[PDB]
Write a protein that binds this DNA or RNA. Structure first.
Lengths: 129, 186, 82, 206, 149, 82
RNA sequence: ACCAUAAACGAUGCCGACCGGCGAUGCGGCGGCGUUAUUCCCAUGACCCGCCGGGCAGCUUC
RNA sequence: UUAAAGUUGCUGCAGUUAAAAAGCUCGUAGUUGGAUCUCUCUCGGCCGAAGCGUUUACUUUGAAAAAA
């Protein structure tokens, strides 16, 4: 059955960005997914999206600017201390010049560079570059 | 006619309660109007020049206003100038309980008294004679959202001119950007 | 494909899909308004009705249920509501 | 034809399209060609939208006019029903015709004297001329083609939706493309009808 | 897909978006509740009442008219069954198989279907025992199976 | 691309596909660069300008280069609406 | 009555999402010119043109 | 004995034909599980003492952690 609904959405906009498509429909929406997509959009990787209100759960139609190379989830959400952040971005990120790791911290969902700036650890959701 | 919780009326409330007891004494709606009461009133500025009145009714008396609302809005607009009147229930929003709260939180808050449920029910009754047949939320490139509300086409010419006051009202008492559309078919 | 507006399909295209695969789902049924020819009463009837509906005045059948959609009797004029 | 009153399809062009049968497609429908169909009628034959045949033709004409040396456009038909229209497109335009069998290695084998280096490729049928299509994916060569309803659109870049099975339709499409490329250049004016009758391009078999 | 069957199928209801009652419907909440009350006294299950109210009354959803469910109305009034209607129909099916099976002892493909039915009863009984609908010692047994229906 | 002093330290900046923003590589021999001519809006004759579209080889092997050229030219007003 | 074992073979765990086309077939449902049979008429059956949903398969593809 | 060994694989392997997927279904533990909800009271000097706020996990801090 469908567990880890964010792993569905990140696989859908990975597989559609490879096919050169302009829009993806991901369903069901969630508030974790919307905060993940907002982090990607504010660094230029996706572009605007529209949440479609069914009364059951959402659907999101994401626009795709072809800048995304890879969008991934990390399952399970391991606890990441702030001293452990360098090993995670050594394993996951392709360069020290670009790419992001998305953490859920207690100050919100944010990328790994902002979490250092707020001096916070948390749990890892995924990564994009 | 104006029965607040803090128990002090004001100038618009007096001028609206008088206009409502006028309908209690001349029009044929006395059987409905003698049972009801309002709770607050405001006048906000929309569109740079247009004005709008926000009647506040109690939520147990909400559906009784909605049987007679279309015969109320034009007749109130005749007594005033061109000023679109809007009826909105008076709903509490109990705050989200945290790890640092008070012991007035003894029983769990009902889901109707949440912020999402109140903002999505305020959106239901201010557009009253039409229905909401669909919502889209557009998240723009600066992180800001913009709600699009598709209204019913069967009451299009009734409230087509009101949609620039509706958005200003919902920006006033909620704080959100809303556009109102009319789809050709569902 | 590969540039298809998923937000705004055409209204003859959402009508074609399965009722849960639409952008917002919606049923294929409706409430008809069946008139009995040898009577005056007007009855509300579900279009995909199960067990057979009797007009209580004339005590006659209005629609025998079928697999998909209720089959009316011969001579019952009906209109679809809203 | 960017909503310009100079370039709209006139009455006589529609009459020639209807007389030749360039609106009637085939029986099957490719999923890439679905954008140009009005509807499938009875007797299973798809009708091609002539407003979209006219605008894809006007888009191809701009792609041919945008090449300075006019001999760098090549025009290819490997079946006999379009071999005469290719040879008269190149006499009116100035392109380089290739009729009959396309030699595998014309565009890639640089040792031979058969080696050519065009800048644009116009093709009468993407199914019959499959070999000059695949060789254009080796030498960075854009490709116009006359596509029926069952045509595959791998490596075509401007897909003119006409009928290309009947002998009148092919000749009419090549004639009208020649007239459009000559009208868009400095030569013949858009006022008077063209001197060349469109029956110089038809393939009259024995 | 299905739990005990090896199939998958997309066949279900699909509620509309609009949660309001339609304007043609003239029944209020109280007379609809009166219809539910008079229909529950013929032994009709909650799933059979909503079919009657949909087919011949125009009540598309009782939740949209009354603001409440069918089973909550019959439970607040007191007209509710002792054991729930989807667990009731599973025991009734397990009785009828065991009745047929004691005549026909060679029927292997009712003996196999009995195990699938009876394991679905224990899976459904555990849920109602966690949610405290059944008293937490109620046990389905083959001896006292036939007395419960 | 740029160092901290601001020099451009790169052999060349490669082109990007106008349909799908992919980098057209050095040995991408199926990729296209195509000029579409611009006309004067009262004679319908070739002005001298054009409009350049580049499309990578994977889009052309997909069969999607026809629709991509069409919606790129439709956004520039070269192909009219409908 | 026991025994419970096989090229027990798709030599291929189970559940879930996404990712190309094409024509058939089986079942159910929804529509649609026109043929037949029940003398007409509907209503149905046999065909024909689609659409939807699960199924058994097949062809095809940088 | 460690690296080489991504040939023990958490990072990080494999199971059609190379070693390998249970005859089939049921089913306990285990593992994993769909959306959804935006701080105050008496005293002691406008703040502290008195309560915490459902309870944890998490995260950041502090102090406590022998030397070598």
């Amino acid at each position: 059955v469908r567990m880890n609904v964010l792993a569905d959405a990140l696989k859908s906009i990975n597989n559609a960005e490879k096919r050169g498509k302009r829009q993806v429909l991901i369903r069901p929406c969630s508030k974790v997914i919307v905060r993940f997509l907002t982090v990607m959009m504010k660094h230029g990787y996706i572009g605007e999206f529209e949440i479609i209100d069914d009364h059951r759960a959402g659907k999101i139609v994401v626009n795709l600017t072809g800048r995304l190379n890879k969008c991934g989830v990390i399952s399970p959400r391991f606890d990441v201390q702030l001293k452990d952040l360098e090993k995670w971005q050594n394993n996951l990120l392709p360069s020290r010049q670009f790419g992001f790791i998305v953490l859920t911290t207690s100050a919100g969902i944010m990328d790994h560079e902002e979490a250092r700036r707020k001096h916070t650890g948390g749990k890892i959701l995924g990564f994009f570059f | 006619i104006v029965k607040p919780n803090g128990e002090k009326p004001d100038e618009f409330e007096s001028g609206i309660s008088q206009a409502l007891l006028e309908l209690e004494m001349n029009s044929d709606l006395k059987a409905q109007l003698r049972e009801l009461n309002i709770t607050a009133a405001k006048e906000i500025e929309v569109g740079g020049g247009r004005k709008a009145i926000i009647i506040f009714v109690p939520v147990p008396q909400l559906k009784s206003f909605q049987k007679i609302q279309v015969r109320l809005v034009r007749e109130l607009e005749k007594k005033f100038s061109g000023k679109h009147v809007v009826f909105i229930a008076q709903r509490r929003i109990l705050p989200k309980p945290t790890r640092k709260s008070r012991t007035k939180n003894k029983q769990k808050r009902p889901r109707s008294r949440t912020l999402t449920a109140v903002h999505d029910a305020i959106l239901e009754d201010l557009v009253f004679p039409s229905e909401i047949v669909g919502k889209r939320i557009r998240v723009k490139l600066d992180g800001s959202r913009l709600i699009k509300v598709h209204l019913d086409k069967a009451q299009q010419n009734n409230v087509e001119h009101k949609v620039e006051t509706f958005s200003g009202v919902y920006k006033k008492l909620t704080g959100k950007d809303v556009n109102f559309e009319f789809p050709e078919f569902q | 494909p590969l540039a298809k507006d998923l937000l705004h399909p055409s209204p003859e295209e959402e009508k074609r899909k399965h009722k849960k695969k639409r952008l917002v789902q919606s049923p294929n049924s409706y409430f008809m308004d069946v008139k009995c020819p040898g009577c005056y009463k007007i009855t509300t009837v579900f279009s995909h009705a199960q067990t057979v509906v009797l007009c209580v005045g004339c005590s006659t059948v209005l629609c025998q249920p079928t697999g998909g959609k209720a089959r009316l009797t011969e001579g019952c004029s009906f209109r679809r509501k809203q | 034809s960017g909503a310009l009153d100079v370039l709209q399809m006139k009455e006589e062009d529609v009459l020639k399209f209807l007389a030749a049968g360039t609106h009637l497609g085939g029986t099957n429908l490719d999923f890439q060609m679905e954008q140009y169909i009005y509807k499938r009628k009875s007797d299973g034959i798809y009708i091609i939208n002539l407003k979209r045949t006219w605008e894809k033709l006007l888009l191809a004409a701009r792609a041919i006019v945008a090449i300075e040396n006019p001999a760098d456009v090549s025009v290819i038909s490997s079946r006999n029903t379009g071999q005469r229209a290719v040879l008269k497109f190149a006499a009116a335009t100035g392109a380089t015709p290739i009729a009959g069998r396309f030699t595998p290695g014309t565009f890639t084998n640089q040792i031979q004297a058969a080696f050519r280096e065009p800048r644009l490729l116009v093709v009468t049928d993407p199914r019959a001329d499959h070999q000059p299509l695949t060789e254009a994916s080796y030498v960075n060569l854009p490709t116009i083609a006359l596509c029926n309803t069952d045509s595959p659109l791998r490596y075509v870049d401007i897909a003119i939706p006409c009928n290309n099975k009947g002998a009148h339709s092919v000749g009419l499409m090549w004639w009208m493309l020649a007239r459009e490329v000559l009208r868009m250049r400095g030569t013949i004016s858009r006022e008077h009808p063209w001197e060349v009758m469109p029956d110089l391009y038809f393939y009259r078999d024995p | 897909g299905r739990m005990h069957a090896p199939g998958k199928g997309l066949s279900q209801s699909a509620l509309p978006y609009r949660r309001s009652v339609p304007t043609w419907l003239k029944l209020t909440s109280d007379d609809v509740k009166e219809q539910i009350y008079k229909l529950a006294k013929k032994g009709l299950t909650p799933s059979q009442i909503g079919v009657i109210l949909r087919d011949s009354h125009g009540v598309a959803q009782v939740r949209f008219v009354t603001g409440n469910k069918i089973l909550r109305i019959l439970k607040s009034k007191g007209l509710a069954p002792d054991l729930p209607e989807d667990l009731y129909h599973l025991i009734k099916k397990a009785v009828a198989v065991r009745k047929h099976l004691e005549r026909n002892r060679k029927d292997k493909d009712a003996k196999f279907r009995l195990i699938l039915i009876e394991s679905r009863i224990h899976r459904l009984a555990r849920y109602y025992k966690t949610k405290r609908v059944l008293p937490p010692n109620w046990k389905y047994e083959s001896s006292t199976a036939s007395a419960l229906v | 691309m740029q160092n901290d002093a601001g020099e451009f330290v790169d052999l060349y900046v490669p082109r990007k596909c106008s349909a799908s923003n992919r980098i057209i590589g050095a040995k991408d021999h199926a990729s296209i660069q195509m000029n579409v001519a611009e006309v004067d809006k009262v004679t319908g004759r070739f002005n001298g300008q054009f409009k350049t579209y580049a499309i990578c080889g994977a889009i052309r092997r997909m069969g999607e280069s026809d629709d991509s050229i069409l919606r790129l030219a439709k956004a520039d007003g070269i192909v009219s609406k409908n």
